[PDB]
Amino acid sequence: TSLFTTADHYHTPLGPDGTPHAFFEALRDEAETTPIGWSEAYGGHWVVAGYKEIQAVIQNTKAFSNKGVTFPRYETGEFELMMAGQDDPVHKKYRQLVAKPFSPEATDLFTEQLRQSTNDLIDARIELGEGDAATWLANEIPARLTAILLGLPPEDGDTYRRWVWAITHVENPEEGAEIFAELVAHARTLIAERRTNPGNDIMSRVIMSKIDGESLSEDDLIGFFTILLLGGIDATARFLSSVFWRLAWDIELRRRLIAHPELIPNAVDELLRFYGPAMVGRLVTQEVTVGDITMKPGQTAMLWFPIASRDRSAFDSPDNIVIERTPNRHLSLGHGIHRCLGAHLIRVEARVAITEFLKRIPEFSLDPNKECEWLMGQVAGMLHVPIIFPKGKRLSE
């Protein structure tokens, strides 16, 4: 028997802790013998689990196209995924338009604003002694910031999350497509308003941009809106949720981050290795051999970053969260020409979220009377993290 044969990133066996990590560890073990295996899920596809094999695939853009970046394809109607779903030279020209606002200096401008935001969110339940850390904090910190980056109302996160749910999970394809069309209607309204009232936000920037002398089409602009909203609120929320869950029970990790706040950036990087939500696909466009396996045009390869992030030939003691680990060249943010546009931004969001939360609520635990829930898929992580804690005091009021 092989664990590859029924591997499916939307249906990962969960262990007694509520995560897929026992299964990932078992697949990692098998991958030492077979780093690429055939799964019969989704009609048949390749699962790439070894670290060096994922590196080989993700560097080989001639044979492995980002037209397959989501598999099964995300529900975005007739729209492509902007940047993420493109190959060069097209990909590079679109990404250049938004490189500046995602640079470390540009995103660092939001640091203290994120800190204030995080504290305002914590104020809403600190006097109560209980909350779902995912819905209360993890969902809201990145959704509010993303809203501000796109010039959306930050208070409407439930609307934005409903759109993303349709893109990533709704099973009835008519329904999912209709809800995605709601996002598209709102994007058109936003774009029309920005045209007349341009600001310093990222949508105004791409609206005023040109490629090869031509303004972007309304469709390309909707594409930018979609990928930035999607990227900004989904994997960030799942990652932060998984982190709050881990900190709720892992009292040893928690006390160390309180004692050594200077280690929080490196610990965020290690938590990205361990809880990185993402996997990505590639469409095979030319016959290619990777290790023992020859892939053929039209096949899809899924890059199982969480398994490669646990590869013993790439990391010492990969099953331990070693907060001082360097260089820690994990693949949770990708590698090569598509490497995550939001990399620096999530590092800042996570550092601030963890720092302020542990400052405000150093003592907390999982609620024994409510269930946690792990969401599976191409972006995976805790969805519900009910916690309890001693009642504390609001900063504002």
Residues near ligand HEM, by CB under 6 A: 66, 69, 83-84, 91, 95, 146, 227-228, 231-232, 235-236, 239, 276-278, 280, 332-334, 338, 340-342, 345-346
d(CA 65, CA 90): 12
Q: Of 126 and 229, which CB lies nearer to ligand HEM in the complex structure?
A: 229
**Does residue 150 touch ligand CNL according to CB under 6 A?**
no
Cβ atoms of 64 and 295 within 8 Å: the answer is: no
Three-state secondary structure call for residue 230 = helix
Which of 39, 65, 70, 242: binder of ligand CNL (CB under 6 A)? 70
Cβ atoms of 249 and 222 within 8 Å: the answer is: no
Scanning 99-107, 111-119, 223-231, 362-370 for contacts with ligand CNL by CB under 6 A, the matching segment is 223-231
Hey, which residues between 280 and 319 contact ligand CNL (CB under 6 A)? Answer: 280
**Does residue 278 touch ligand CNL according to CB under 6 A?**
yes
d(CA 254, CA 354): 10
Three-state secondary structure call for residue 356 = helix
Residue 177 binding: pick among ligand HEM, ligand CNL, none (C-beta 5-8 Å cut-off by kind): none
**Does residue 379 touch ligand CNL according to CB under 6 A?**
yes
Residue type at position 181: A
d(CA 311, CA 317): 9
- Tell the smallest beta-carbon distance from residue 250 to ligand CNL (Å): 26
Q: Report residue 2: phi and psi, to 5°.
A: -130, 140
**Does residue 231 touch ligand CNL according to CB under 6 A?**
yes
Number of C-beta neighbours around residue 391 at 10 A: 10
Q: Of 51 and 239, which CB lies nearer to ligand HEM in the complex structure?
A: 239
- Tell the smallest beta-carbon distance from residue 259 to ligand CNL (Å): 34
Cβ atoms of 236 and 346 within 8 Å: the answer is: yes
User: Alpha helices, DSSP H only, in the chain?
Assistant: 21-31, 51-59, 90-96, 104-108, 111-123, 133, 140-150, 157-168, 173-196, 202-207, 218-249, 251-259, 264-275, 305-308, 343-360
Residue 332 binding: pick among ligand CNL, ligand HEM, none (C-beta 5-8 Å cut-off by kind): ligand HEM
| Cis-peptide, bond into residue 89, ω within 30° of zero | yes
Which of 69, 206, 268, 352: binder of ligand CNL (CB under 6 A)? 69
**Does residue 84 touch ligand CNL according to CB under 6 A?**
yes
Residue 83 binding: pick among ligand CNL, ligand HEM, none (C-beta 5-8 Å cut-off by kind): ligand HEM
- Tell the smallest beta-carbon distance from residue 378 to ligand CNL (Å): 5
Closest-CB residue for ligand CNL? 231
**Does residue 346 touch ligand CNL according to CB under 6 A?**
no
Q: Between 13 and 42, how does the x/- string for binding to ligand CNL read (CB under 6 A)? A: ------------------------------
Q: Of 71 and 389, which CB lies nearer to ligand HEM in the complex structure?
A: 71
Question: Considering only CA atoms, which of 9, 6, 11, 50 is closest in space to residue 28?
Answer: 50
Q: What is the 8-class DSSP label of residue 137?
A: I
**Residues counted in the chain:** 397
- Tell the smallest beta-carbon distance from residue 116 to ligand CNL (Å): 27
Question: Contacts with ligand CNL: how many residues (CB under 6 A)?
Answer: 12
**Does residue 227 touch ligand CNL according to CB under 6 A?**
yes
DSSP states of 22-58 as a string? HHHHHHHHHHTT-SEEEE-GGGSEEEE-SHHHHHHHH
Q: Which residues bind ligand CNL (CB under 6 A)?
A: 69-70, 81, 84, 227, 230-231, 235, 278, 280, 378-379
